[PDB]
Design an enzyme around this catalytic site. Structure first.
Site, PDB file in Angstrom:
ATOM      1  N   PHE A 220       0.835  -1.224   0.000  1.00 17.81           N
ATOM      2  CA  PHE A 220       0.000   0.000   0.000  1.00 17.81           C
ATOM      3  C   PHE A 220       0.859   1.261   0.000  1.00 17.81           C
ATOM      4  O   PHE A 220       0.343   2.375   0.119  1.00 17.81           O
ATOM      5  CB  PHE A 220      -0.987  -0.040   1.196  1.00 17.81           C
ATOM      6  CG  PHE A 220      -0.363  -0.339   2.482  1.00 17.81           C
ATOM      7  CD1 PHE A 220       0.484   0.582   3.117  1.00 17.81           C
ATOM      8  CD2 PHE A 220      -0.640  -1.584   3.122  1.00 17.81           C
ATOM      9  CE1 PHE A 220       1.066   0.288   4.390  1.00 17.81           C
ATOM     10  CE2 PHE A 220      -0.096  -1.901   4.390  1.00 17.81           C
ATOM     11  CZ  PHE A 220       0.766  -0.967   5.018  1.00 17.81           C
ATOM     12  N   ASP A 293       1.966 -10.404  17.679  1.00 14.11           N
ATOM     13  CA  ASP A 293       3.088  -9.501  17.296  1.00 14.11           C
ATOM     14  C   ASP A 293       2.650  -8.124  16.838  1.00 14.11           C
ATOM     15  O   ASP A 293       3.233  -7.549  15.941  1.00 14.11           O
ATOM     16  CB  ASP A 293       3.929 -10.180  16.212  1.00 14.11           C
ATOM     17  CG  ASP A 293       4.626 -11.407  16.719  1.00 14.11           C
ATOM     18  OD1 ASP A 293       3.966 -12.215  17.391  1.00 14.11           O
ATOM     19  OD2 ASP A 293       5.807 -11.592  16.413  1.00 14.11           O
TER      20      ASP A 293
HETATM   21  N1  ADE Z   1       1.505  -4.570   2.392  1.00 11.11           N
HETATM   22  C1  ADE Z   1       2.396  -3.634   2.749  1.00 11.11           C
HETATM   23  N2  ADE Z   1       2.424  -2.392   2.104  1.00 11.11           N
HETATM   24  C2  ADE Z   1       3.339  -1.434   2.455  1.00 11.11           C
HETATM   25  N3  ADE Z   1       4.272  -1.563   3.463  1.00 11.11           N
HETATM   26  C3  ADE Z   1       4.251  -2.852   4.055  1.00 11.11           C
HETATM   27  N4  ADE Z   1       4.984  -3.277   5.111  1.00 11.11           N
HETATM   28  C4  ADE Z   1       4.559  -4.595   5.376  1.00 11.11           C
HETATM   29  N5  ADE Z   1       3.553  -5.002   4.635  1.00 11.11           N
HETATM   30  C5  ADE Z   1       3.313  -3.888   3.819  1.00 11.11           C
END
Ligand code: ADE
Length: 421
Positions: A220, A293
């Site tokens: 994302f 976590d």
């Molecule tokens: N899906 C994701 N999008 C952006 N940063 C991340 N950090 C861990 N998972 C993520």
């Protein structure tokens, strides 16, 4: 120490260096500070003139790399670096890190991987060592670009669209065997339940390359433009960084931020109300699915033009239920990373936690009781169906033990909701 121009997509942000005295610094590009659409690389490193020497400089960049020494050693190996220090590290792979802090000491291409070549890269990442899913601290994250239905390696400075995670495997402890060999299927499943429950989470697909199955989660912190011409990176940082804290205190039991400090911090978000509601809802959710976590680095904010921030979606969601039983752990050992309010202290025992505990935390955090109630009530009537929907939407080669381990334990907790809402 030499320089590495800091870039935000296609704009020069500043420069990073270090000293032989053991100190580190950073400097913002004057033309960056001059733009009306400027913004700090980190909320802990406010936009300003002249190099910054505060620890926040090191912490911020040091939080850009795995907090595990074991993991760092591997990287420092297959890349040859002076040491484990951030610079030497980022001076090699800082081309596609977390957020939009692209580093470099004319593109729009990639390279498709054959099913045989894909299985080659994935295998490139993988003895005898207060339970936490990341206890092994031996899980190396990677990324890949997905064009259509193919997996490719970004060519040049081209960004990635997915974070790839391989199985954690079975962790062998003196008195316990942690079976996290199905961590890929675990998270995959957990991410579906979260979506079905209205939570803001990314989509994830299980990669099938050879005999190795992996997890591909959409990033994302990336985004295709309207014409799918350019893949843009989006600024972003985690709670440790924003607070200028080292990854070593990500956990509250270690002095890290808990639910209180983050909720208070979110009151300054461009989406305060929404972000506080969502954050709180994720706490109830983590409890329900046994996510242990949820440390400070498991939450992040999007840095927007002007230095404004808002909560990003939730990620790295793995249930501990599948590790329950036999020579593994037992429900009695499942503890949230961020404890809730108790009658005369804190509550972390997922087993000894009930609706009253969340309602009590809301009140002290000034989170509308009517909202906390709606969250509890909403899960009480949607969980039953949510589970079945997720299930009836899972592949045929999906392990039952995982679904059974999570679903049962989930329904076991969800009961405390129906018998109150
Ligand atoms: N899906 C994701 N999008 C952006 N940063 C991340 N950090 C861990 N998972 C993520």
């Amino acid at each position: 120490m030499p320089k590495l121009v800091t870039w935000m997509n296609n704009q020069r942000v500043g420069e990073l260096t270090k000293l032989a005295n053991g100190a580190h610094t950073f400097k913002y590009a004057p033309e960056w500070l001059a733009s009306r659409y400027a913004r700090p690389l980190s909320l802990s490193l406010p936009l300003q003139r002249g190099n910054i020497t505060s620890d926040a400089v090191f912490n911020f960049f040091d939080n850009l790399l795995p907090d595990s020494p074991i993991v760092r050693d591997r990287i420092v190996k297959r890349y040859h670096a002076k040491s484990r220090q951030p610079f030497d590290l980022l001076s090699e792979i800082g081309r596609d890190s977390v957020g939009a802090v692209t580093l470099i000491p004319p593109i729009m291409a990639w390279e498709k991987l054959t099913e045989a070549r894909l299985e080659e890269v994935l295998t490139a990442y993988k003895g005898m060592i207060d339970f936490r899913i990341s206890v092994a601290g031996a899980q190396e994250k990677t990324a890949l670009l997905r064009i259509g239905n193919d997996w490719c390696i970004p060519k040049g400075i081209t960004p990635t669209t997915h974070i790839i995670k391989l199985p954690i495997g079975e962790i062998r402890q003196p008195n316990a065997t942690l079976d996290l060999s199905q961590s890929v299927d675990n998270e995959y499943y957990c991410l579906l339940l979260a979506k079905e429950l209205g939570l803001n989470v990314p989509d994830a697909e299980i990669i099938k390359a050879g005999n190795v199955r992996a997890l591909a989660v959409e990033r994302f912190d990336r985004r295709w433009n309207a014409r799918r011409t350019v893949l843009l990176r989006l600024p972003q940082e985690d709670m440790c960084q924003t607070f200028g804290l080292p990854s070593s205190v990500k956990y509250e039991s270690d002095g890290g931020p808990g639910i209180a400090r983050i909720m208070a911090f979110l009151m300054g978000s461009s989406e305060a109300l929404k972000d506080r509601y969502d954050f709180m809802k994720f706490q109830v959710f983590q409890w329900l699915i046994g996510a242990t976590d949820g440390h400070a680095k498991n939450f992040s904010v999007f840095i927007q033009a002007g230095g404004s921030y808002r909560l990003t979606p939730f990620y790295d969601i793995i249930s501990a239920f599948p590790v329950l039983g036999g020579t593994g752990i037992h429900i009695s050992d499942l503890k949230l990373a961020m404890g809730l309010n108790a009658s005369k202290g804190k509550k972390t025992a997922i087993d000894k936690i009930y609706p009253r505990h969340f309602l009590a935390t809301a009140k002290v955090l000034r989170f509308p009781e009517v909202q906390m109630h709606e969250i509890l009530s909403d899960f009480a009537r949607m969980i039953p169906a949510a589970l079945d929907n997720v299930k009836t939407s899972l592949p045929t080669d999906f392990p039952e033990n995982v679904v059974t381990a999570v679903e049962s334990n989930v329904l076991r907790l969800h009961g405390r909701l129906s018998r109150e809402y």
